[PDB]
């Protein structure tokens, strides 16, 4: 989408995975979907270094709406859980130097059963712009036809454009199209800043593996379409929650950098381990994700329960990730000719290699003839950056 | 097995899950099955508090053997990887105050292809006793008949007895019966100190869930068989390795305490996080596992992606574990009448409740009519101890 936005993958926080559709503010006041939750997250995004690391979009997912529209047919936030309204919340978020994302659905209802935007695309776009919204996530539930799905996603893209406000447009169009028809990613990129391809992530290693496997399976279709203004979205970062071991968290962070993925944390910034925070705020890895060239990486090799992915970066540099998919035993040795990396140019005639994950360590100079050996933890990833000696 | 051993579930360390059958000492010297690995592991078991917490048996699994027996038809350790021999290794381990476990197979070969014990049961038992072995894990590969399987397990039990040396006898008999016929656990208990029931664990939450679900599904068949001298073995602890989140590690530790499981760590004690170490050395949870009453716990309830397990303990106390099996979202609330716990006895007329996991905190006095409310992390467990009292 040529709206000047998402020139690098969008970074921020999104409530869905960790907080879901909790409406019980009476019994769960600190975890229900409320304006207080988002205010606390914005406060911590400033005070705990998230904004400085690049996480900029504080995003509301489903279940913010009142059950019905206003008299003029406009969406309204729930009067009890969002008593001051979205425009005020956006004002607060902006006062923190942050941007505010909101959620709507292309069909007749949101996935959780709240008002859909079908028949109100222009009204809803102008409402979001008036509120000061900076990002829209657009879900695909309750849509009776593929033609209505495509038409709705394109119409909402155009309506957002016509408001004149810069609004990042995040689409679930491919995900809801895939079971029925192969998506045309040239068109999707024309209308969306990033797009969800695969099933919702949850707090499990199984979900990480599924997302990676589906991405590599479909890489010939989706890798080349991604770039500044339009990204593949493999769904939220779940680092800092409950289901991932440390090495599985490392794998998610490294591979979301390789994939030029949007980095939307879905966690509780009020209760997050120092290790999870240091990983999520890892300047070198974020710099890979945010590389201005914006070329998505890909799986180079798979075999012997290992995977090798790589990503071309600005200025003759490359990122390389090695995943150990064997879920038994100890760290396993993997060796690869450096001439096989970066299409044969990364280390011709030599490259300096720096390991970034799981720990940062300079490995030294590797000649074009060299072989790189590493030991990779089960379900973990070794992430390296290769700099051509010029 | 009425040999005076395993009056509580055996505790120690077993190499299989973490180190497997790595024979490449040239390229993977820190991971290969060698006498130096076991010597260093024994040193750390002493120096890092493992022995003090109760982990006493340093156990060799498969792939310690030479490819053939010696001229006298006796098993030998690999001359390159175990040049000083099992007897010296046992002397070293004993000098550290620890006990040494070894591995053999009921059939013609071990599962990795090394010499089996069929036809040599008495020779092999007396060999292990001469070496100073204190525990034998007995695998079931390469056995042509169920009759040979059962006869071999019983025969090796008797041969170990005949040596006169106290040797804990760990059997895989039930697991190897399952494809053909349901096991008779009365017989197995008569011959074994503990027995593996289910597939090998690996370094994954999937494996933990599978073991728990198979145990609860089959609990009416196996729970009452367990007791002092004979335990169900749901396989090694994998806390301290790579595949389990903190909450999943908590779940394994809590539930292995509930199940009166042998506690055989399979990890690398040279590279273990302080959090994993504190969990594995948790004195209160180990005390639950080692409860002298020796009655295995069970699943009390399951539903809405929650599980409630409980275990009766000595002196009218109970351990209660609540598992959140929903793998999305945040900590979920669970409420239960304390009268529903511990068969209605734990809190009659009252109980003092102490949360032990994921953090230790006294919760207070609960009357028989009261309700306990807790929040459980996704894939995590809350473990509580209930102490019966009349005080309030
Ligand atoms: C509604 O849709 C229209 C059409 O799709 C869209 O207009 C487009 O806006 C983008 C960004 O604002 C334009 O791209 C710019 O083109 C100008 C040409 O003068 C360039 O100078 C810009 O360069 C930027 O990036 C440079 C590096 O590449 C930097 O030097 C610097 O940061 C510049 O800002 C940039 O390429 C695009 O040309 C127009 N297209 C048309 C047809 O007008 C508009 O933004 C949309 N409006 C909303 C509210 O979404
Ligand atoms: C070879 O096998 C034989 C039997 O097949 C086995 O001897 C049996 O087991 C133990 C040996 O320690 C005996 O049990 C003891 O019996 C006396 C009887 O008065 C009791 O006082 C003992 O009680 C103490 O120890 C118990 C722990 O086991 C506690 O429960 C108790 O509170 C006391 O502390 C104990 O029960 C058993 O009687 C014999 N049975 C026979 C001989 O028929 C022998 O040990 C095996 N040898 C080897 C080397 O394994
Ligand atoms: C996928 O969609 C794109 C855009 O909707 C199609 O590309 C356009 O094709 C028309 C002709 O049908 C050309 O006039 C445009 O110039 C093309 N646009 C771009 C940006 O190239 C493309 O044909 C579609 N592909 C399939 C297989 O349907
Ligand atoms: C180990 O192998 C030997 C040789 O095959 C087995 O002995 C055979 O046993 C089968 C039935 O069990 C008989 O039909 C053969 O006549 C036996 N052959 C010999 C040479 O004795 C032995 O049973 C095997 N042991 C185990 C535990 O499977
Ligand atoms: C919404 O419902 C109406 C009436 O049932 C239907 O005509 C319309 O196509 C629906 N819209 C979508 C996007 O499914
Ligand atoms: C199991 O074995 C024991 C000991 O041999 C025997 O007493 C019992 O009857 C057996 N049970 C069944 C069901 O065969
Ligand atoms: C079901 N919806 C949820 C909101 O209800 C999340 O936004 C999820 O991303 C989407 C399905 N892909
Ligand atoms: C395959 N053997 C392995 C030794 O080779 C482990 O001892 C495992 O316990 C058993 C299978 N249940």
Coordinates of N, CA, C and O in Angstrom, one line a residue, chain A residues 41-134:
Chain A
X41 N -0.7 0.2 29.4 CA 0.3 -0.3 28.4 C 1.0 0.9 27.8 O 2.2 0.8 27.6
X42 N 0.3 2.0 27.5 CA 1.0 3.1 26.9 C 2.0 3.7 27.9 O 3.1 4.0 27.5
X43 N 1.6 3.8 29.1 CA 2.5 4.3 30.2 C 3.8 3.5 30.2 O 4.9 4.0 30.2
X44 N 3.6 2.2 30.2 CA 4.8 1.3 30.3 C 5.6 1.3 29.0 O 6.9 1.1 29.0
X45 N 5.0 1.4 27.9 CA 5.7 1.5 26.6 C 6.6 2.7 26.6 O 7.7 2.6 26.0
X46 N 6.2 3.8 27.2 CA 7.2 4.9 27.4 C 8.2 4.6 28.5 O 9.4 4.6 28.2
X47 N 7.7 4.2 29.7 CA 8.7 4.2 30.8 C 9.6 3.0 30.8 O 10.7 3.1 31.4
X48 N 9.3 1.9 30.1 CA 10.1 0.7 30.2 C 11.0 0.5 28.9 O 11.5 -0.6 28.7
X49 N 11.1 1.5 28.1 CA 12.0 1.5 26.9 C 11.4 0.9 25.7 O 12.2 0.8 24.7
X50 N 10.1 0.5 25.6 CA 9.6 -0.1 24.4 C 9.5 0.9 23.3 O 9.9 0.5 22.1
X51 N 9.1 2.1 23.5 CA 9.0 3.1 22.5 C 10.4 3.4 21.9 O 10.6 3.5 20.7
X52 N 11.4 3.5 22.8 CA 12.8 3.8 22.4 C 13.3 2.6 21.5 O 14.1 2.9 20.6
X53 N 12.9 1.4 21.8 CA 13.3 0.3 21.0 C 12.6 0.2 19.6 O 13.0 -0.5 18.7
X54 N 11.5 1.0 19.5 CA 10.8 1.1 18.2 C 9.3 0.7 18.2 O 8.6 0.9 17.2
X55 N 8.8 0.1 19.3 CA 7.4 -0.3 19.4 C 6.6 0.9 19.6 O 6.6 1.6 20.7
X56 N 5.8 1.3 18.6 CA 5.2 2.6 18.5 C 3.6 2.5 18.4 O 3.0 3.4 18.9
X57 N 3.0 1.4 17.9 CA 1.6 1.3 17.7 C 1.0 0.5 18.9 O 1.2 -0.7 19.0
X58 N 0.2 1.2 19.7 CA -0.6 0.6 20.7 C -2.0 0.3 20.2 O -2.8 1.2 19.9
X59 N -2.3 -1.0 20.0 CA -3.4 -1.5 19.2 C -4.5 -2.2 20.0 O -4.2 -3.1 20.7
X60 N -5.7 -1.7 19.8 CA -6.9 -2.4 20.3 C -7.4 -3.4 19.3 O -7.5 -3.1 18.1
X61 N -7.7 -4.6 19.7 CA -8.2 -5.7 18.9 C -9.7 -5.8 19.1 O -10.3 -4.7 19.5
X62 N -10.3 -6.9 18.8 CA -11.8 -7.1 18.9 C -12.2 -6.8 20.4 O -11.5 -6.9 21.3
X63 N -13.5 -6.6 20.5 CA -14.3 -6.4 21.8 C -14.0 -5.1 22.5 O -14.0 -5.0 23.7
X64 N -13.9 -4.0 21.7 CA -13.9 -2.7 22.3 C -15.3 -2.0 22.0 O -15.5 -0.9 22.7
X65 N -16.1 -2.5 21.2 CA -17.3 -1.8 20.7 C -18.5 -2.0 21.7 O -18.6 -3.0 22.4
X66 N -19.3 -1.0 21.7 CA -20.7 -1.1 22.3 C -21.5 -2.1 21.4 O -21.1 -2.3 20.2
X67 N -22.6 -2.7 21.9 CA -23.3 -3.6 21.1 C -24.0 -3.1 19.9 O -24.3 -3.8 19.0
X68 N -24.3 -1.7 19.8 CA -24.9 -1.1 18.7 C -24.3 0.2 18.4 O -23.5 0.8 19.2
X69 N -24.5 0.7 17.1 CA -24.1 2.0 16.7 C -24.9 3.1 17.3 O -25.9 2.9 17.9
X70 N -24.4 4.4 17.1 CA -25.0 5.6 17.6 C -26.2 5.9 16.7 O -26.6 5.2 15.8
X71 N -26.9 7.1 17.0 CA -28.1 7.5 16.2 C -27.7 7.7 14.8 O -28.5 7.3 13.9
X72 N -26.6 8.3 14.5 CA -26.2 8.6 13.1 C -25.5 7.3 12.5 O -24.8 7.5 11.5
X73 N -25.7 6.1 13.1 CA -25.1 4.9 12.5 C -23.6 4.8 12.7 O -23.0 4.1 11.8
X74 N -23.0 5.4 13.6 CA -21.6 5.4 13.8 C -21.2 4.4 15.0 O -21.9 4.2 15.9
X75 N -20.1 3.7 14.8 CA -19.6 2.9 15.8 C -19.3 3.7 17.1 O -19.0 4.8 17.1
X76 N -19.5 3.0 18.3 CA -19.2 3.6 19.6 C -18.4 2.5 20.4 O -18.7 1.3 20.3
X77 N -17.5 3.0 21.2 CA -16.9 2.2 22.2 C -17.8 1.9 23.3 O -18.8 2.6 23.6
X78 N -17.6 0.8 24.0 CA -18.4 0.4 25.1 C -18.4 1.4 26.2 O -17.4 1.9 26.7
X79 N -19.6 1.9 26.6 CA -19.7 3.0 27.5 C -19.1 2.7 28.9 O -18.7 3.6 29.6
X80 N -19.2 1.5 29.3 CA -18.7 1.1 30.6 C -17.2 0.8 30.6 O -16.5 1.2 31.6
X81 N -16.7 0.2 29.6 CA -15.2 -0.2 29.6 C -14.4 0.9 28.9 O -13.2 1.0 29.2
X82 N -15.0 1.7 28.1 CA -14.3 2.8 27.4 C -15.1 4.1 27.7 O -15.5 4.7 26.7
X83 N -15.2 4.5 28.9 CA -16.2 5.6 29.2 C -15.8 6.9 28.6 O -16.7 7.7 28.2
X84 N -14.5 7.2 28.4 CA -14.1 8.5 27.8 C -14.0 8.4 26.3 O -13.8 9.5 25.7
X85 N -14.2 7.3 25.6 CA -14.3 7.2 24.2 C -12.9 7.1 23.5 O -11.9 7.5 24.1
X86 N -12.9 6.7 22.3 CA -11.6 6.4 21.6 C -10.8 7.7 21.3 O -9.6 7.6 21.3
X87 N -11.5 8.8 21.0 CA -10.8 10.0 20.6 C -9.9 10.5 21.8 O -8.7 10.8 21.6
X88 N -10.4 10.4 23.0 CA -9.7 10.8 24.2 C -8.5 9.8 24.5 O -7.4 10.2 24.8
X89 N -8.8 8.5 24.3 CA -7.7 7.5 24.4 C -6.6 7.8 23.4 O -5.4 7.7 23.8
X90 N -6.9 8.1 22.2 CA -6.0 8.4 21.2 C -5.2 9.7 21.6 O -4.0 9.7 21.3
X91 N -5.9 10.7 22.1 CA -5.2 11.9 22.6 C -4.1 11.5 23.6 O -3.0 12.0 23.6
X92 N -4.5 10.7 24.6 CA -3.5 10.2 25.6 C -2.3 9.5 25.0 O -1.2 9.8 25.3
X93 N -2.6 8.6 24.1 CA -1.6 7.8 23.5 C -0.6 8.7 22.7 O 0.6 8.5 22.7
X94 N -1.2 9.6 21.9 CA -0.4 10.6 21.2 C 0.4 11.5 22.1 O 1.6 11.8 21.8
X95 N -0.1 11.9 23.3 CA 0.6 12.7 24.2 C 1.8 11.9 24.7 O 2.8 12.5 25.1
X96 N 1.8 10.6 24.7 CA 2.9 9.8 25.0 C 3.9 9.6 23.9 O 4.9 8.9 24.0
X97 N 3.6 10.2 22.7 CA 4.5 10.0 21.5 C 4.2 8.7 20.8 O 5.0 8.3 19.9
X98 N 3.1 8.0 21.1 CA 2.7 6.7 20.5 C 1.6 6.9 19.5 O 1.0 8.0 19.4
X99 N 1.3 5.8 18.8 CA 0.2 5.8 17.9 C -0.8 4.7 18.3 O -0.5 3.7 18.9
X100 N -2.1 4.9 17.9 CA -3.2 4.1 18.4 C -3.8 3.3 17.2 O -4.1 3.9 16.2
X101 N -3.9 2.0 17.4 CA -4.5 1.1 16.4 C -5.9 0.6 16.9 O -6.1 0.5 18.1
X102 N -6.8 0.4 16.0 CA -8.2 0.0 16.3 C -8.5 -1.2 15.4 O -7.7 -1.6 14.5
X103 N -9.7 -1.8 15.7 CA -10.1 -3.1 15.0 C -11.5 -2.9 14.5 O -12.4 -2.3 15.1
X104 N -11.7 -3.5 13.3 CA -13.1 -3.6 12.7 C -13.1 -4.8 11.8 O -12.1 -5.5 11.7
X105 N -14.3 -5.1 11.3 CA -14.5 -6.3 10.5 C -15.2 -6.0 9.2 O -16.1 -5.2 9.2
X106 N -14.8 -6.7 8.1 CA -15.3 -6.4 6.8 C -16.7 -6.8 6.6 O -17.4 -6.3 5.8
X107 N -17.2 -7.8 7.4 CA -18.5 -8.4 7.3 C -19.6 -7.7 8.1 O -19.5 -6.5 8.4
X108 N -20.6 -8.5 8.4 CA -21.7 -8.0 9.1 C -21.5 -7.9 10.6 O -22.2 -7.1 11.3
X109 N -20.6 -8.7 11.2 CA -20.3 -8.7 12.6 C -18.8 -8.9 12.8 O -18.1 -9.5 11.9
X110 N -18.2 -8.4 13.9 CA -16.9 -8.9 14.2 C -16.9 -10.3 14.6 O -17.9 -10.9 14.9
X111 N -15.7 -10.9 14.7 CA -15.6 -12.4 15.0 C -16.2 -12.6 16.4 O -16.7 -13.7 16.6
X112 N -16.2 -11.7 17.3 CA -16.8 -11.8 18.6 C -18.2 -11.4 18.7 O -18.8 -11.6 19.7
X113 N -18.8 -11.0 17.6 CA -20.2 -10.7 17.5 C -20.6 -9.3 17.6 O -21.8 -9.0 17.8
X114 N -19.7 -8.3 17.6 CA -20.0 -6.9 17.7 C -20.2 -6.3 16.3 O -20.0 -7.0 15.3
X115 N -20.6 -5.1 16.2 CA -21.0 -4.5 14.9 C -19.9 -4.6 13.8 O -18.8 -4.2 14.0
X116 N -20.3 -5.2 12.7 CA -19.5 -5.2 11.5 C -19.5 -3.9 10.7 O -20.4 -3.0 11.0
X117 N -18.7 -3.8 9.7 CA -18.5 -2.6 9.0 C -19.2 -2.6 7.6 O -19.2 -1.6 6.9
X118 N -19.7 -3.8 7.2 CA -20.4 -3.9 5.9 C -21.5 -2.9 5.9 O -22.4 -2.9 6.8
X119 N -21.6 -2.1 4.8 CA -22.6 -1.1 4.7 C -22.2 0.2 5.3 O -22.9 1.2 5.2
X120 N -21.0 0.3 6.0 CA -20.6 1.5 6.7 C -19.1 1.8 6.5 O -18.5 2.5 7.3
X121 N -18.6 1.3 5.4 CA -17.1 1.4 5.2 C -16.7 2.9 5.3 O -15.7 3.2 6.0
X122 N -17.3 3.8 4.5 CA -16.9 5.2 4.5 C -17.2 5.8 5.8 O -16.4 6.6 6.3
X123 N -18.4 5.6 6.4 CA -18.7 6.1 7.7 C -17.6 5.7 8.7 O -17.1 6.5 9.5
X124 N -17.3 4.4 8.8 CA -16.4 3.9 9.7 C -15.0 4.4 9.5 O -14.3 4.8 10.5
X125 N -14.5 4.6 8.3 CA -13.2 5.1 8.0 C -13.2 6.6 8.5 O -12.2 7.0 9.1
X126 N -14.2 7.4 8.2 CA -14.2 8.8 8.6 C -14.3 8.9 10.1 O -13.7 9.8 10.7
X127 N -15.0 8.0 10.8 CA -15.1 8.0 12.2 C -13.7 7.7 12.8 O -13.2 8.4 13.7
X128 N -13.0 6.7 12.3 CA -11.7 6.4 12.8 C -10.7 7.6 12.6 O -10.0 7.9 13.5
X129 N -10.8 8.2 11.5 CA -9.9 9.4 11.2 C -10.3 10.5 12.2 O -9.3 11.1 12.8
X130 N -11.5 10.8 12.4 CA -12.0 11.8 13.4 C -11.5 11.5 14.8 O -11.1 12.4 15.5
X131 N -11.5 10.2 15.1 CA -11.0 9.9 16.5 C -9.5 10.0 16.6 O -9.0 10.0 17.7
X132 N -8.7 10.1 15.5 CA -7.3 10.1 15.6 C -6.7 8.8 15.5 O -5.5 8.6 15.9
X133 N -7.4 7.8 15.0 CA -6.8 6.4 14.8 C -5.7 6.5 13.8 O -5.7 7.2 12.8
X134 N -4.6 5.7 14.1 CA -3.4 5.7 13.3 C -3.2 4.3 12.6 O -2.4 4.2 11.7

